[PDB]
Design a protein around this ligand. Structure first.
Ligand SMILES: Oc1ccc(SSc2ccc(O)cc2O)c(O)c1
Ligand SMILES: OSc1ccc(O)cc1O
Ligand SMILES: [Zn+2]
Length: 257
């Protein structure tokens, strides 16, 4: 019964999920002046040309666009990663106001939202096994700022009315996640966790430096979603983000000078 309210939000999660106070929790603040350029990192390869989206689901915490991951149709390779990581889903975290909503921060700056493209390491055979491994997932994080509209987001925005409440899903075929990427793949990377319960410490984070711009109308449509199920008191799905957690004994590496 975890959530994002005062009574069940991030400050409470550690009681059911003690790993919340673990050594590699996410998100973190990215201090750009202490992250170090790593010339050892190989180029990042985002290969999404054969992606097969299936469905979109309101799970009561966010909405997930879900992909067919039964073959290497959309994969992430390179950068800090060894081997091949398959796209399974993406989701966002966002705010009630344009000045908050992201999970990662950059020199303490909060963006309006943050996209998480979730990929699992194919050496572990499926997602459920991958999340039990320290290198099981690679999550590509992309910041959203409010400005110009993002055409590649509009198909997502326009289906949200059909999944307003928790447990609702809809068909969502033929969506191209390449339309959600910025021009540059410059990134920061560090080892961390899921930012929601169960908070598993299985993620190589790859957070892009360049935000995408989305329009005020696009983000407003995210804010009309509901945390509740149909036939329950309405609580708007906003501020579904966890604040920054202690970096502890981790280093953030940059792919760029
Ligand atoms: O092999 C597949 C199994 C499940 C899905 S649903 S996405 C999905 C994946 C992980 C989640 O914790 C939540 C999600 O909604 C999928 O797309 C493929
Ligand atoms: O970032 S929160 C989060 C939740 C589920 C997941 O499979 C991956 C994630 O990174
Ligand atoms: Zn997330």
């Amino acid at each position: 019964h975890w959530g994002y309210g005062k009574h069940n939000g991030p400050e409470h999660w550690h009681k059911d999920f003690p790993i919340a106070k673990g050594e590699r929790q996410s998100p973190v603040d990215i201090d750009t002046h202490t992250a170090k350029y790593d010339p050892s990192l190989k180029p990042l390869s985002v290969s999404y040309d054969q992606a097969t989206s299936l469905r979109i689901l309101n799970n009561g915490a966010a909405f997930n666009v879900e992909f067919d991951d039964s073959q290497d149709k959309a994969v992430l390779k390179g950068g800090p990663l060894d081997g091949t990581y398959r796209l399974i889903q993406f989701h966002f975290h966002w705010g009630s106001l344009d000045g908050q909503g992201s999970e990662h921060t950059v020199d303490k700056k909060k963006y309006a939202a943050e996209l998480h493209l979730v990929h699992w390491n194919t050496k572990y055979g499926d997602f459920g096994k991958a999340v039990q491994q320290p290198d099981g997932l690679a999550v590509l994080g992309i910041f959203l700022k409010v400005g110009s509209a993002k055409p590649g987001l509009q198909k997502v925005v326009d289906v949200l009315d059909s999944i307003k409440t928790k447990g609702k899903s809809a068909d969502f075929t033929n969506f191209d996640p390449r339309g959600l990427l910025p021009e540059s793949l410059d990134y920061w990377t560090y080892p961390g966790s899921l930012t929601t319960p169960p908070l598993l410490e299985c993620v190589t984070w790859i957070v892009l430096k360049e935000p995408i711009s989305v329009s005020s109308e696009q983000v407003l449509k995210f804010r009309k979603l509901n945390f509740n199920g149909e036939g329950e008191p309405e609580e708007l799905m906003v501020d579904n983000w966890r604040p920054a957690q202690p970096l502890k004994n981790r280093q953030i590496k940059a792919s760029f000078k």
